[PDB]
Design a protein around this nucleic acid. Sequence first.
DNA 1: TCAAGTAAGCAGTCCGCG
DNA 2: GCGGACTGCTTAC
Length: 901
Amino acid sequence: MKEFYLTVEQIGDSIFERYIDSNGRERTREVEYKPSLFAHCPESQATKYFDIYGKPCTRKLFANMRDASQWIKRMEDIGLEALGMDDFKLAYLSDTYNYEIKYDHTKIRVANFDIEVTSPDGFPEPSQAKHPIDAITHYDSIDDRFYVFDLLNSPYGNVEEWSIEIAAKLQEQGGDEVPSEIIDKIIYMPFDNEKELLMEYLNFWQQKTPVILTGWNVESFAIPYVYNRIKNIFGESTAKRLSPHRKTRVKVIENMYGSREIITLFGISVLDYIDLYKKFSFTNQPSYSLDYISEFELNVGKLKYDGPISKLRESNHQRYISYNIIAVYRVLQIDAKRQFINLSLDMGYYAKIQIQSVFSPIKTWDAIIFNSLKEQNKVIPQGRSHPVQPYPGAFVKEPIPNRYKYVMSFDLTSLYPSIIRQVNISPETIAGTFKVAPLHDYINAVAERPSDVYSCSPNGMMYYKDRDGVVPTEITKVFNQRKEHKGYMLAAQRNGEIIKEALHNPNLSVDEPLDVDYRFDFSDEIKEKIKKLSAKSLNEMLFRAQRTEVAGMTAQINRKALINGLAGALGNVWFRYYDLRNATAITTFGQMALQWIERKVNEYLNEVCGTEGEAFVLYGDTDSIYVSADKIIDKVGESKFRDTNHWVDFLDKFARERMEPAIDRGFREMCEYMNNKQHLMFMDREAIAGPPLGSKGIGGFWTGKKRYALNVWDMEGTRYAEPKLKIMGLETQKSSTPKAVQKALKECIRRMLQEGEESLQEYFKEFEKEFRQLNYISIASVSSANNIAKYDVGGFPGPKCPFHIRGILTYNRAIKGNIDAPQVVEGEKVYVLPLREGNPFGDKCIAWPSGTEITDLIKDDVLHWMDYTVLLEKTFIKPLEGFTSAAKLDYEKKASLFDMF
DNA sequence: TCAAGTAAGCAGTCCGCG
DNA sequence: GCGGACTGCTTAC
Ligand SMILES: O=c1ccn([C@H]2C[C@H](O)[C@@H](COP(=O)(O)NP(=O)(O)OP(=O)(O)O)O2)c(=O)[nH]1
Ligand SMILES: [Mn+2]
Ligand SMILES: [Mn+2]
Ligand SMILES: [Mn+2]
Ligand SMILES: [Mn+2]
Ligand SMILES: [Mn+2]
Ligand SMILES: [Mn+2]
Ligand SMILES: [Mn+2]
């Protein structure tokens, strides 16, 4: 096969590379790499090398990397540009792998581990590692085995060996329920002493040295803890055996209060799964314990036990070891669903970067663009310094707050990059400028046409129409990948609705799920075979379809994030191709397109409805329009459809047949106007929304910008079995809203939209009567905790102290002295509850870390003092008043000028 | 040169107010 | 007790 790399590092004048050779074997090599950089020279020069502007360049071949750096610095001291790729590991990979890399993931050792450390005296600080490591479980993807290192004797208790037969039993039969499909994959190794355990771990690590290293929080706890514990017992140089080149960086910062640590292990690409999840998952969780996310992602149950984890090894070593194995497996399960490692690998190899660089869009694109330029024998510009300048972004229309019964929506496909391709925006396609009118004049087609010769944006920029840009070119490739995957995703989603519907009519037999690809729309024969399957079969198919759709989501939305990352990068001073002219060319064009198309859609709709000067477009954000369909529905009545699906079918046809072509005509005109290279403003229909036919529902409402709810029947061609609420911005969407209040406001909204005022009130009365019976954690607010120290001391609230930060201080005073209480962590999220006046805490609110019950120390007298009246009003009534005042309903009634028996 | 962007809502603090 | 200027956080895009 063709070779590919695993890791690369720069060590002085040395590149260290781990790689897979042409035979499939893992190898390592040290290369004294000779880098090249370039300098402009006179046009009188025989040279194949030009920079991206067409200026001639001469190559300088250096004997080592140190020299290249030295030269770069003299060039600055002289004031002349030093061109070329200055991140030498990137250039090396580009020289070494001059082809599209087809990697083979079964040869990439992916490791996943979790450690346990008993700690009677508070959270075990990694920067100190003063406690024994009493368990490690380490899964190796190539062995497909879980290696378990278990400490039987430690100064914190002697325990006997762990039992694999008891691990397997149902929890109800006294077992730990280690899932059956991994029981056979476990390899168990007890140890009399910590030293022999760590020694043996290090020996294992050498034989099976991770390429990709993951886990939950491994970056902040496991890795630094292991590194520092090995250091303390054996010395640093032994601790350095964790790096395949024996080099590490610490790192630092710290800082207070009181200390944290991050180790860098050269020759390993660490991808902490919690980071992969934050970047790639597009959720905002109230908490990031493995148990919360596992439950969220997998629908598995909380990992139950009695007593604090500081006594768990002692009271029940058996469960302790089993829960350690399970945590590792759980991260394996989250990844089989989300597929973030596979994505990281796709992106990393595509860009030709270090796999951990996928966290960096700027770095990812620097390498993609660099590689694309080096193929044409071109020379990248030097990275310059720039001051940080704010600049204008998208347009958002101000909506009239109201209920809106029937609404269709339309949204532009991949807007920013589409713009980049339509206008042909690139550092090296800049043609000149033109004198700019106010933006309203373009939108209204009254300003003079910018140019006859160049592609333009209403920010005043002009671009060459003939030559293609490195940016448009490379941004198209990734776009095309996103398109593909989105299709798989949507198809799996439609396939999902078809299965759901068939679940209304099983159908009693004994069968197997059909063998099919959920990435493509079910054929008619397949649809036939399905209408005759059992509930078992069909449920297995729904699961499979929903997993194919999740995979499609991951692959498509993150490819979109990448491309959008490029547009935003142009506005980041650390980006080699930073340039506000390009950044604003994109954004300003986007504001124009949205407002232009608003005008056009109003013009077309007034026409066909024969009416005049009426607003059909009710809202719009960046690249979307929301269209009232009341008068399109009314033009016909009402009657006059048989059921909901009928009018949905109507509007669908009307969008596809009448509106779609006028929109396209509208944007075709806009393209001509700006004389663009290619027409790519494609605005597909999104939601079709309204109340169930016959009901008293309102269908939808806006309260303001970025705050609306819609009852949707069809979404971008997916006709839903049951109506699905599209809620944007409302408290139901905010991670800081208590879980139970989220659910309650959602149900209030479901009612308003589907059933009307009377149903709303009915439910609101019930929730008020029952509020106080809820679990305290389900009605607690949530907040991130930044810049905490600032608002001490000592330790009481200082001036301007935020409410949640106040709660942490109240917590910090409550737990002063008890070495057992779990500590709030700077930058982490916290639960927050208000307290009644006269509480023994001495203030109006308390806060503890999230995803955790509050410590039994103070728990009992927090419950006693929680202020329900304030909670309900703050988190539930205020926001509800918002919704209903906007949609002109009341949640209570209402003094009716009656009343009477 | 370790480093995608802007727009904009709401909850809270501090101050004003016979 | 309510509205205006500010911080802090959080979504929508
Ligand atoms: O995180 C984002 C999201 C969107 N945007 C910009 C770019 C995007 O093209 C534009 C429109 O927002 P959408 O949510 O519609 N995404 P896009 O149009 O790219 O993709 P699509 O509509 O095809 O899903 O807003 C960002 O700059 N950053
Ligand atoms: Mn024994
Ligand atoms: Mn059970
Ligand atoms: Mn654990
Ligand atoms: Mn969309
Ligand atoms: Mn869009
Ligand atoms: Mn779309
Ligand atoms: Mn959009």
